[PDB]
Amino acid sequence: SIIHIGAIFEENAAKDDRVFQLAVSDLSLNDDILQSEKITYSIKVIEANNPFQAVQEACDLMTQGILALVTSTGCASANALQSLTDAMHIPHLFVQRNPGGSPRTACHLNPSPDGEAYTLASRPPVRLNDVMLRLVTELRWQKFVMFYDSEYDIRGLQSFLDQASRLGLDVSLQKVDKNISHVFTSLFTTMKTEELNRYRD
Amino acid sequence: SIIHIGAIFEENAAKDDRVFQLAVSDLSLNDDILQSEKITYSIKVIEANNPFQAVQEACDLMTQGILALVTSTGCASANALQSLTDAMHIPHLFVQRNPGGSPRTACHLNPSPDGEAYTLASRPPVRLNDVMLRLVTELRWQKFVMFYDSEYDIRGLQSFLDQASRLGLDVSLQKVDKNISHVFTSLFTTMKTEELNRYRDTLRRAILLLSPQGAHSFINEAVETNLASKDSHWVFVNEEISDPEILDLVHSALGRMTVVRQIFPSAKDNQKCMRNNHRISSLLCDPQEGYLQMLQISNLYLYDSVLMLANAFHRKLEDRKWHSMASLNCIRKSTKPWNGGRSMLDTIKKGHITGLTGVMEFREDSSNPYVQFEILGTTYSETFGKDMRKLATWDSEKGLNGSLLTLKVVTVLEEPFVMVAENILGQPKRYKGFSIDVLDALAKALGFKYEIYQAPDGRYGHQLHNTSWNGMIGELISKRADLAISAITITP
Numbered sequence: 001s002i003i004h005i006g007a008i009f010e011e012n013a014a015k016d017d018r019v020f021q022l023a024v025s026d027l028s029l030n031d032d033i034l035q036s037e038k039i040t041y042s043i044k045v046i047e048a049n050n051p052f053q054a055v056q057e058a059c060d061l062m063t064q065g066i067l068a069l070v071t072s073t074g075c076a077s078a079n080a081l082q083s084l085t086d087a088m089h090i091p092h093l094f095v096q097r098n099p100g101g102s103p104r105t106a107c108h109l110n111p112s113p114d115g116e117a118y119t120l121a122s123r124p125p126v127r128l129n130d131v132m133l134r135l136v137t138e139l140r141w142q143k144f145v146m147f148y149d150s151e152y153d154i155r156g157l158q159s160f161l162d163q164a165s166r167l168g169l170d171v172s173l174q175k176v177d178k179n180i181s182h183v184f185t186s187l188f189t190t191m192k193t194e195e196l197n198r199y200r201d
Numbered sequence: 202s203i204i205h206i207g208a209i210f211e212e213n214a215a216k217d218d219r220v221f222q223l224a225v226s227d228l229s230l231n232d233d234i235l236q237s238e239k240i241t242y243s244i245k246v247i248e249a250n251n252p253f254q255a256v257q258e259a260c261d262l263m264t265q266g267i268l269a270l271v272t273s274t275g276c277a278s279a280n281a282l283q284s285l286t287d288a289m290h291i292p293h294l295f296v297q298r299n300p301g302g303s304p305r306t307a308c309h310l311n312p313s314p315d316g317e318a319y320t321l322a323s324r325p326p327v328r329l330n331d332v333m334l335r336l337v338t339e340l341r342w343q344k345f346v347m348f349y350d351s352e353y354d355i356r357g358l359q360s361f362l363d364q365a366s367r368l369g370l371d372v373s374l375q376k377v378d379k380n381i382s383h384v385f386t387s388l389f390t391t392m393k394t395e396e397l398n399r400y401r402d403t404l405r406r407a408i409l410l411l412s413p414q415g416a417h418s419f420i421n422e423a424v425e426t427n428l429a430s431k432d433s434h435w436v437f438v439n440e441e442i443s444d445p446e447i448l449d450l451v452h453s454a455l456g457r458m459t460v461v462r463q464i465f466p467s468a469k470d471n472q473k474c475m476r477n478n479h480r481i482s483s484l485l486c487d488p489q490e491g492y493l494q495m496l497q498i499s500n501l502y503l504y505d506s507v508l509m510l511a512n513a514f515h516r517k518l519e520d521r522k523w524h525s526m527a528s529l530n531c532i533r534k535s536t537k538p539w540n541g542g543r544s545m546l547d548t549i550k551k552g553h554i555t556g557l558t559g560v561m562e563f564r565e566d567s568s569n570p571y572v573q574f575e576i577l578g579t580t581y582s583e584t585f586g587k588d589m590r591k592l593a594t595w596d597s598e599k600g601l602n603g604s605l606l607t608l609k610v611v612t613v614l615e616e617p618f619v620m621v622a623e624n625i626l627g628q629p630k631r632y633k634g635f636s637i638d639v640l641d642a643l644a645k646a647l648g649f650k651y652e653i654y655q656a657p658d659g660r661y662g663h664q665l666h667n668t669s670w671n672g673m674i675g676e677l678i679s680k681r682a683d684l685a686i687s688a689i690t691i692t693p
Contacts, residue, residue: 048312049284049311049312050284050287050288050311051280051281051284052281052282052284052285052287052288053284053288055281056288056531056534057534059531059532060532060533060534062532063532063533075277076252076277076280076281077281079250079251079252079253079277079278080251080252080253080255080256080278080281081253082253083248083251083252083253083254084253086253108277110249110250110251110277111212111248111249111250111251112248112250112251145366153356154355154356154359155354155355155356158376161374161376162374162375162376164373164374165346165373165374165375166373166375166391170344170371170372171372172366172367172369172370172372173359173362173363173366173372174363174366174367175363198369199367199369
């Protein structure tokens with residue numbers, strides 16, 4: 001029929017297919033059943049945060065015929081594509097998208113037959129909350145401020161938020177924007193300078 | 202020439218199956234433009250949070266041919282159809298699913314030229330941040346914790362929380378599982394009774410986003426475990442609540458109450474059934490029992506969407522042009538959008554009606570900018586009960602239009618402060634002395650309560666060899682009493 005896999009590359013797709021196609025050529029060279037045998041791929045470089053562009057590739061792949069489903073795409077392009085590969089029986093190897101420059105919290109899975117849910121998550125659940133449970137207690141700090149950029153999903157501290165609600169920590173949560181030159185302006189022009197000094201302390 | 206519409210429902214499709222067939226039931230019956238020219242509809246049901254089944258019940262219905270949509274679905278399925286609506290430009294009215302007990306929180310949208318989307322924020326969006334500003338204004342809050350249920354997303358109302366974190370505030374946040382008696386089983390173990398004291402004192406200004414019957418029983422077990430009195434202020438937050446349902450909240454609720462929901466501009470719902478020579482079922486024209494006392498969003502979206510369909514058949518059919526779907530293969534990637542769908546966008550998206558929520562429109566920004574909440578407080582009366590009355594009203598164009606103790610003494614036997622007024626066996630009942638009067642003048646001139654311990658050592662307690670204090674001293678350093686009133690020669 002066809003010897004074919006698929007791919008959709010976001011962010012810097014030039015880095016993605018540079019890492020992809022070289023290892024594809026190396027492992028097509030090096031496979032004791034696929035000795036010099038060409039697995040074919042259809043990389044679709046898509047626009048940023050447009051998962052339907054990945055999905056119309058994957059339904060095109062269904063109209064092509066594929067072997068497995070390897071990707072690095074958004075979590076909105078994981079639910080439809082898993083239940084798409086449900087009836088046609090394709091492994092749904094899913095790699096979650098990047099949050100934008102923030103560290104990653106893993107995305108929620110959707111209602112499905114669990115155990116029969118085979119969206120193969122290559123990226124583990126975030127376990128820095130296990131560390132941050134301990135760091136506030138080994139260095140013993142009750143008052144501090146947590147900060148963030150606008151590129152993160154603020155749910156991702158949820159058990160760390162619950163233990164900090166019950167640990168008695170009184171910790172501010174404060175947004176930082178991208179223009180760092182305007183940061184000190186929006187601090188100093190807005191804060192009174194002794195209030196600034198209070199927040200300095 | 203077909204008049205076919207469609208339906209794709211997820212999660213609790215049963216009331217989803219109910220409302221849309223009622224939305225077409227009186228549509229060939231009471232809508233006057235297409236009166237007894239029958240409007241057909243193939244209601245299709247998908248599994249909860251599955252966009253692939255939604256596309257199977259969308260593009261097949263396209264091949265079957267469809268005209269208009271009266272639709273609500275969730276978060277994860279909407280953004281893929283949003284990028285579809287950037288890539289196929291489909292006319293669609295949207296309501297995000299509310300998980301219940303807490304309000305819905307908005308799902309993140311793709312970056313797009315706004316005006317074309319699957320999600321338009323037909324619901325009144327996240328706004329309660331300035332509603333949060335009014336009690337830290339009025340009652341001047343310093344510490345507070347949100348009680349939100351297990352299925353609440355805390356991203357929408359972050360806007361108050363960051364800037365108030367820039368005002369030196371203190372905060373906590375607690376997610377709440379459903380078995381609320383078992384929640385207190387999880388708490389009374391982890392809470393000591395002095396921790397129960399400090400947490401009730403943290404609980405004098407409550408913030409609640411909780412599952413309804415669970416929230417009623419949470420009121421009852423706050424009353425029974427005496428976590429409340431007429432000082433304890435309570436904030437309830439959910440849009441999904443009926444008008445007698447708040448009265449059903451306040452039966453055991455006997456403290457300071459505050460409940461917010463989406464209350465419309467003030468107008469009479471009677472005589473609104475006869476609108477545009479139609480017979481629109483409403484709260485007194487069809488007072489369906491077991492269907493009003495518990496709210497869901499599908500009945501607010503029932504009234505406006507079919508009146509928009511009456512405006513659609515009025516305008517679009519009389520504007521000399523006809524449009525019916527010439528389909529495209531959603532499996533194919535060279536199928537451009539259908540040519541006359543730009544007309545059907547104005548059939549759905551950017552029209553103009555004035556419903557019970559006031560004017561509902563959409564433009565090239567795809568949001569709802571204005572929200573009017575009404576912000577009420579308590580009124581004490583042990584006979585007519587708690588009847589929530591207007592402290593103020595709110596709008597998202599001005600902010601708020603208006604505004605809104607027992608302790609353990611511990612005893613050491615002493616010569617001047619202690620003189621036995623009455624004694625019994627083992628541990629006596631009540632002494633007298635000077636520090637009795639010191640204890641008195643507080644409780645008689647401040648209006649709160651007291652309890653009394655006795656020290657097991659009672660001998661001017663000392664810095665032990667245990668790096669510890671005995672007597673009356675370490676009891677407040679193990680922190681197992683509250684107050685100590687004696688001859689205290691203070692050391693640094």
